[PDB]
Amino acid sequence: EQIEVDVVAVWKEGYVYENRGSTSVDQKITITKGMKNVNSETRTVTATHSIGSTISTGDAFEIGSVEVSYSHSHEESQVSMTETEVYESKVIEHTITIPPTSKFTRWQLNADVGGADIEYMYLIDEVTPIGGTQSIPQVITSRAKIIVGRQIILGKTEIRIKHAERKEYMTVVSRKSWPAATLGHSKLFKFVLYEDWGGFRIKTLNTMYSGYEYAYSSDQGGIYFDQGTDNPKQRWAINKSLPLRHGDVVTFMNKYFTRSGLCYDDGPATNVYCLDKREDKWILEVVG
Amino acid sequence: EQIEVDVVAVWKEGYVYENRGSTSVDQKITITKGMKNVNSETRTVTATHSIGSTISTGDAFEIGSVEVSYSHSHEESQVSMTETEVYESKVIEHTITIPPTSKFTRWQLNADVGGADIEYMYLIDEVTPIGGTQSIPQVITSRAKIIVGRQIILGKTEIRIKHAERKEYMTVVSRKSWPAATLGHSKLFKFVLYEDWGGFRIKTLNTMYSGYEYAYSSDQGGIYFDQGTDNPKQRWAINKSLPLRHGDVVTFMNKYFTRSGLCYDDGPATNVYCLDKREDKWILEVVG
Amino acid sequence: EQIEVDVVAVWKEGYVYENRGSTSVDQKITITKGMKNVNSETRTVTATHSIGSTISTGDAFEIGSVEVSYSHSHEESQVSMTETEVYESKVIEHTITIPPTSKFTRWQLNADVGGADIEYMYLIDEVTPIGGTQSIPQVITSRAKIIVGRQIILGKTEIRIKHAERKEYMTVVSRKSWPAATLGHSKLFKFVLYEDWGGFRIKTLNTMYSGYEYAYSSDQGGIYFDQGTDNPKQRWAINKSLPLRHGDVVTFMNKYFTRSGLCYDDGPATNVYCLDKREDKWILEVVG
Amino acid sequence: EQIEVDVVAVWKEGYVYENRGSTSVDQKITITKGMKNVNSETRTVTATHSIGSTISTGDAFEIGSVEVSYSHSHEESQVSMTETEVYESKVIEHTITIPPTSKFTRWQLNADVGGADIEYMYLIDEVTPIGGTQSIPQVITSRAKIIVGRQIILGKTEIRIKHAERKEYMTVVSRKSWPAATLGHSKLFKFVLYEDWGGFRIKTLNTMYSGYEYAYSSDQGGIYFDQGTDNPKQRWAINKSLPLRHGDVVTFMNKYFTRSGLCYDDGPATNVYCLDKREDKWILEVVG
């Protein structure tokens, strides 16, 4: 089920090499791009035992005083660091033999695909004789055909929500005596996105307490589930325009709490919050 | 005993290279992905001995005072750091000679297999002439055939539980005068998963105290074994839908304590707890 | 829709190699240029419990005093560093065999394209016999043809604003009871640039409160939206001369607050400010 | 519009290799030159809460005293480092097979071009038989032909000033109720250099307040714009002798404040100052 689309590729970085000499030139251009995230968690437990003892004689031994301050201190400290480095590089080398009196031109464009919100690095290497009218592509526009996943029909489509950075699915647990959203490795928990005039409602199918089905943000910040109402707190706002599709990255922004968005945070007894300035990317996928 | 399945591969990262020049181009793309975990445990023992002695004369030697504060301090400190670095990389290089007036297109998809919860990196390299209608695959869906292990029949199947990160099996030991779960290298300890209307019950076969067979979470957090009851504390919730199979990664989430899950933690005299926000991955395997 | 333009390339770095010997020489020149940005965020929580106890006897036990100061201190500290290294290199090697009694000359120019504000590294390698009249290019001027994107018609063109460094779009949220600009991953929010005699007005289409449409800077610094007036606070100044085009990097400088410019900053409940000495680069793109 | 010039190349570093043996020798000489600039900006926020409580009994409980000093301290510190490494290397390898009974001689000269103030590394490799009269070039003088940019006619030439290190153009903003120079990404701001008997005057075309056109240094240090007068404060001194040309690196030194020069500095509400011992390099370029 593919769809046509207008891709646009804006410039990023160019490079030209005008070989004028009689000899040819071998040329190698390596573009490296590398992320490296490290998450350390040191716990330290220091324990000191100090025994001070001062012997002083000023009043009775009149003429002056001798104050002998002995002191001892045994300090036992136990540290325990725990790093977790994760790194990802992408080297891209291109070896080209540039002929004599030919200029080589690399144009690195960043091709952003419309609709789908996909982007890809679009290099353009040319080798042509000199002198000539140089054609620098500031913005290229290509007509692409995206092969696309199954469309999510809002209402009557069971989709499981997944956090993109964590790779942990959205689950339902009982905080207080209320159903509440939490990140978890379980794929059993499913959701159904609904659309009213107000906005998007995330309804659960697997809920502990019966009736309490539609997700909403509390005054505190945490996510709980309530009954279907006309409350703007239980509505949400999706970043991508309809229709929603398989493997679609979205960011649920609360309608009442306009600033805040559905996100991960290390809270007490719940870890899916609607905090101010938090637009966490949720990949949503469909069940078989 | 293989089974059919719908694999789906969502986009991750793309890359295009439009060679337009008369000369061909050799191209090398190295994708590195490397984890590195380091676990240090420093113990430090400092020991100071300080001998202060102050001689003061203000009262008797009237006009002012001379206060001579001598002091000494011998500090013997012994440190003992112990790191344990473990690193795992996976470099993936692809050398390709791109012909003249041909574009090369790499599409990196992340192929998530349905049911089994397996995922794999699915690269798609193409080399085709220009200009042409570009076909960007946002979501590919493939029909795969998983060769699958032996199915776990809930009741009448002896399975030993194993912690995925630690590679240590679940064992039974006597905490207080109660059988309790602990991580250990022994494979002799076996379990039988049962399913009632409430949820999943982890029953032991090798227990110290007779009768106390089914796993349950205490008010404290630690795991103990009790008799068969209608208590939701002794039920559990598995992340993968049935049927359970060999080499299946699961996360046992307590039914009463909805937030907490069966997990590893450095506690006193037991190291398998049901702590809040802890979904530790247990690979469960079948005995021969 | 391409346009002609005068490119100018000013000198950066030169290099000459006069091989005079009878034997030829293989020559390899690697130009590396590498950025590496690292963003750590350590949170530390130290917790000390100290129990001092001093036993002193000076008054009653007359002749001097024995002051025995015992003390204890248990210090539990938990650190949690989180780095996020991102690095980008660009190595450029050129292997050339220089013949006998020939000089090789590399001239590295930095070719700045006019109008479009694009720049690219322009190397010039020559190989010629010796001795000869050396031709050093301080400033080359080339006539280029920029392939350019769709032109933004000021008024009647829906453009979404995007922060260049963050790759986050400009969005509208309700700060206080006022519509206010914020960075966000949502592409649904669109803007229309207007031009009066005073300057450039950024009007929103998707606003929460009706009427409050045109962006303006407050006395505090934060960006809010107001009605259309003759106020210089709601005007702005764009760095590139007209016409504005697709994928155009701009810097909106407030007309009233001449120093300040539309920018990202970690504020409370809004993150798009007009702070003094802040010229953040906004790529603006057109909707399909 | 090229011009002739006398290039002079003074010695830097030599190297000789006298192969005397019957076998030839392959020789590889790599000259690396690498800059690496790193700009970190750590912000740290420590927050301690300490609750000391001491219970003492000396007066009433007569014979001595027991002073029990309990104390607590919770220290929450949040660090946030942000490095920005930028590195640039230039490796230059030359592989040469030196024949038997031939000496190889590399002479590295630093060729400084006259007038234009351009410099380039000028290597001289020779391979010749032995023994012979060695010709060491301490100072070579070459006649070059610089291809030069468009000449700046002082008065009636609109030139935009650009900071070389920052790559940020000179702009005009309103500090106090006075037009003042600031660095900015806007290319709209233009200047016209004038020459009187006193010195060089930097006049603006785009000024906020009408009349206040010519740049001058204040008693504080900051740059403002005033009317045309016979004041030496508004004159300047350019490092390169006339005529000024496209892509010309200059350093504007104030005539009154002889020590100080037009430069970048992080001041409050203006960032282009005339500070003592500051000769910042301004590339000045011409408008199309």
Add this chain to the structure above:
Amino acid sequence: EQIEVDVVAVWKEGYVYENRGSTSVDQKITITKGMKNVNSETRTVTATHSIGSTISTGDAFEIGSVEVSYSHSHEESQVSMTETEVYESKVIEHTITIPPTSKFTRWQLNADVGGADIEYMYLIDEVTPIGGTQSIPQVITSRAKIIVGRQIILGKTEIRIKHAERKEYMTVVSRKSWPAATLGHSKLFKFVLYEDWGGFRIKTLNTMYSGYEYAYSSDQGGIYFDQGTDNPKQRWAINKSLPLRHGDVVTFMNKYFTRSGLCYDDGPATNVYCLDKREDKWILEVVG
């Protein structure tokens, strides 16, 4: 305008390799020499706000005392490191196949050229059969022909002085109401070296105050310009014997202040001093 000269090359480092076996041996000797200079400049701004409050009750609440010392401290510190690494390596590899029953001998001499004060690394590789009378060159003397720059005629030669390490020319500015020497990027400032019976006088041509022409050292240390006198303070001593030539590295040592020499130092409002134990190398060059 070349001149003959006696080069002398004293030993540095030798190496011999006596291959005695029937098989030949490939041999690679890499001599690396690498400088790396790093110049960091960290600025740190710490700001603490601490609110201590102690509540004590000893006098009225008679029997002992409870002293409850609460305390708070918010410490905001901003660091800003700025390194500037510059590195220069020179690897020199020589691959040689040593034949059977032949010894290879490398002798590294450091060839210091007379008069001109130029030096160069002079390797001597030999390959000869064994056994033989070994000829170790402790000191070689070669007759070279230096190609030399234009001679500086003392009086009637305009030369601009340049600091070798900084690559900044000597300039004249007004410190107090006196002309004073400073480092600067301007090449407009010229000097004329004069020679009397006493020593060398550095006269300026471009001076602010008329008459004050000849350089001299003050009692403080800084360099100013005075009228022509018989004062030894305004004389100087050059390290190289006459005649002075183009691209000549010199060190101006004051005649009165025999220890001190013309040098760079970060002083207030002047940066060219005559400090004790400072022999900074000034390259002096001639104007076209």
Add this chain to the structure above:
Amino acid sequence: EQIEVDVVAVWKEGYVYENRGSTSVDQKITITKGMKNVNSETRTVTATHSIGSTISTGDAFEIGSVEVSYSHSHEESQVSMTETEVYESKVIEHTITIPPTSKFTRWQLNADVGGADIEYMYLIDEVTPIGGTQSIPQVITSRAKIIVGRQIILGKTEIRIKHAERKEYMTVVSRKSWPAATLGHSKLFKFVLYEDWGGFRIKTLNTMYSGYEYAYSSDQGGIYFDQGTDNPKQRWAINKSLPLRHGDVVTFMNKYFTRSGLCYDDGPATNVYCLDKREDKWILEVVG
């Protein structure tokens, strides 16, 4: 003017490889030897401003006391590190194909040449069949022919003294009202070594004060010049036996102060001292 000499090479390190198999073996042995000296000089300037204010009420507000200790502290610290790394490596690789049933034997000897005090690494690689009587060379003695520089005739030979580590010549300056030795870049200063029955006298030719010609050590440690006397303080002791030659490394040890030797040290207003336990190597060279 070459001279014969007995070289002796004592053992350092051996290595044997007995290939017994039917297949041959390629073998590569890399001997690396690398020095790396780093000279950092950090200057730090911390500046604190602290404003404490305590409000206390105990006497008047009778029953106890409230002591509110507010405090503030602004700490501005500026650091400025400056490293200067210099590194020198010498890798020596030897690739050899060892034939079947042949042993390869490397013997690394350190060949110390007599008289001249030159040393060089003397490797001996052999390849021979097995089994055989192994010939291990503990001490080899070779007859070499040193090509030697011009001999220094003690008296009537102008030689300039040079510090080996610093590469700075010995110069004469006026400390107090006395001529004194200092390190400097000037080659104009010359010396003449004289030999009496007592020892070696370093006489200057270029001296400021007439008569004060012969070098001597003071009671303080610094080097000054005095008239010719029978004082042992002005005599010296050279490490190499006569005759002295060009490029000869010597260590001048004072005859009176037997422990101390002529050396470099950072003193006030003189930097050539005769300190205890200081045998700095002076290369002495002859003038043309």
Add this chain to the structure above:
Amino acid sequence: EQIEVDVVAVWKEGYVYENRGSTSVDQKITITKGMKNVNSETRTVTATHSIGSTISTGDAFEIGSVEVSYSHSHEESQVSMTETEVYESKVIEHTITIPPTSKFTRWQLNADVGGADIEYMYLIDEVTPIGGTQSIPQVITSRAKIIVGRQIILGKTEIRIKHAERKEYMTVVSRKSWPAATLGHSKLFKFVLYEDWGGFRIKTLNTMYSGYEYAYSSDQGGIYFDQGTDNPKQRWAINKSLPLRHGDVVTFMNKYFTRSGLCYDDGPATNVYCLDKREDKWILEVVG
């Protein structure tokens, strides 16, 4: 003057590789052994100037007190680190193609030569078919022929003593009014080893005070020279059995002070001591 000897090579490390497959296998085994010694010497000079001023009003301003404690502190610290890294590696690679159904066996023995106290790494690589009776060499004994230096005749042989680690010869200087041993670069100082019934006596030839010739250890520890006596303090004990030879590494252990040995140590005014637990290796060599 060679001598026969029994070499013995004890096992160190083995390695076997049994290739059983039909395809051959290329195999590369790199043994690296690398020493790296770094000797830093940081000198730091901190200088604080602190101006505290407290204004207090409690007595007169009755009801409580305001105590305003202002304070200032300017801390100027200058650090100066100086590392001196010296590293030496020895990589040893052996590339071998192991044929099908052949096992490769490396046995690394450490061959210690008798008498001479020389040792060398003795590898044994074998390649043979499988299966076979494996012959593991725990201890090999080879008959070698050491080519040996000139024998030292105890009495009537002038030998100069040299410290192995420092490469500095033993010299004589006047500590107090006594001749004393010191390390120095001078080769003029010679010694003659004598042997009595008691032990070895190190006699000097070049001594300052006449008569005081034979080396002995003081009660302090330092080495001085005395007349010939029957004192065990002036005797010594050599580690190698007679006869002593050229380039012989020895350790002189005092006969009276049995624990202590002739060694280097940074003492005041002498640097050759006889300290407890110090067996410094002295290479002793013969004069020509």
